[PDB]
């Protein structure tokens, strides 16, 4: 009846105005079986990682144009400490294994009031590469404080700026005009999503199961799911009201598994 409270481990979250919980593809997204591509003893969930982890995004401002977006690669967020996120036990255990698989639960929060106008779209895009710079290297924490909100242009629309394999000098460089990771703004509502606007609610909750091309993926590189936020109607408010609303989100892993124990990972 618009009041709900979600509990897990030693943490609990509530809301004074809810719209429901969206289950992605199945009746019970939590149910899952151990992987069949490894024969060692796996490591199921323990009570110290059944939690909600919270972080902070950049603030929404009226100067933002339409279809500008922000992205958050789920398994990569912990590893890169984006937006101040820190997993503690989950991060420590993820840094000490070779393989990992798990679903997710996410929720976003905003604090608009009845005197504001605007709308935000929140969706979970699978198998995306919005977190990588055109040169092919992951964005540093300094770049986010400059590109507050990612712009939208024909390059993103057509996937013409994807990661690039240098072709050497024996050939002659061609003209690149299309790629498989394009983004089509008008069709983003295909993925599991909820629409957030000033007049109706202040939070959105989505539940998602595991997906991958193999039963399990490498810990340090898998990027199957990604969180997306996009602007549909630019913000506007009467002069004198509260400005620059804040945004926050929380995440929870479900039915994890691990395999291939080893020492702390180190790049080389």
């Amino acid at each position: 009846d618009r009041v709900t409270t979600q509990t897990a481990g030693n943490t609990a979250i509530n809301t004074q105005s809810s719209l429901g919980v969206l289950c992605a593809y199945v009746e019970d997204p939590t149910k899952s079986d151990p992987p069949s591509s490894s024969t060692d003893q796996p490591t199921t969930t323990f009570t110290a990682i059944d939690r909600w982890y919270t972080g902070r995004l950049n603030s929404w401002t009226k100067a933002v144009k339409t279809f500008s977006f922000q992205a958050v690669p789920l398994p990569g967020a912990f590893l890169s400490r984006q937006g101040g996120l820190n997993g503690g036990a989950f991060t420590a255990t993820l840094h000490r294994h070779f393989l990992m698989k798990c679903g997710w639960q996410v929720q976003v929060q905003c604090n608009l009031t009845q005197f504001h106008q605007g709308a935000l779209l929140v969706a979970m895009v699978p198998e995306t590469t919005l977190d990588v710079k055109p040169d092919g290297k992951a964005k540093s924490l300094q770049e986010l404080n400059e590109e507050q909100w990612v712009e939208m242009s024909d390059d993103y629309r057509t996937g013409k700026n994807m990661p690039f394999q240098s072709l050497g000098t024996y050939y002659r460089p061609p003209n690149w005009t299309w790629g498989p990771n394009f983004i089509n703004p008008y069709q983003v509502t295909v993925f599991p999503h909820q629409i957030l606007n000033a007049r109706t609610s202040t939070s959105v909750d989505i539940n998602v199961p595991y997906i991958g091309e193999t039963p399990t993926q490498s810990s340090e590189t898998q990027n199957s799911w990604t969180l997306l936020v996009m602007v549909l109607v630019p913000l506007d408010y009467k002069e004198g009201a509260t400005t620059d609303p804040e945004i926050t989100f929380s995440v929870r892993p479900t039915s994890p598994y691990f395999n291939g124990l080893r020492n702390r990972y180190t790049a080389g």
Partner: protein, 119 residues
Amino acid sequence: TFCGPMMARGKFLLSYSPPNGTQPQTLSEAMQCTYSIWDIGLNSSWTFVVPYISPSDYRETRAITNSVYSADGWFSLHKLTKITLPPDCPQSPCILFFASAGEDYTLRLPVDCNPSYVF
């Protein structure tokens, strides 16, 4: 299999490290991975099994490039303690290796063979 004098005594450490950025280089690192302790005694041989831990069913049998589907880590042997020998015995014993398929080993998808051996 240990083929040294019957009077010797010692211990060895065997470890298997899944893939990482850099391979192990010390006992402290080796202890954390999968490993076992083998001690010289009456019986001479000791068997070790490399578990099949892979991100996908089936794996390639040749490594054109070190994708995760071809290379699968390293195996290393560590001398836990030095060997003890009585006076008037030869030094530097030797150890021997054997390799074989497991119980649940399987192959698939034949391919043409390389004739370079004739040269």
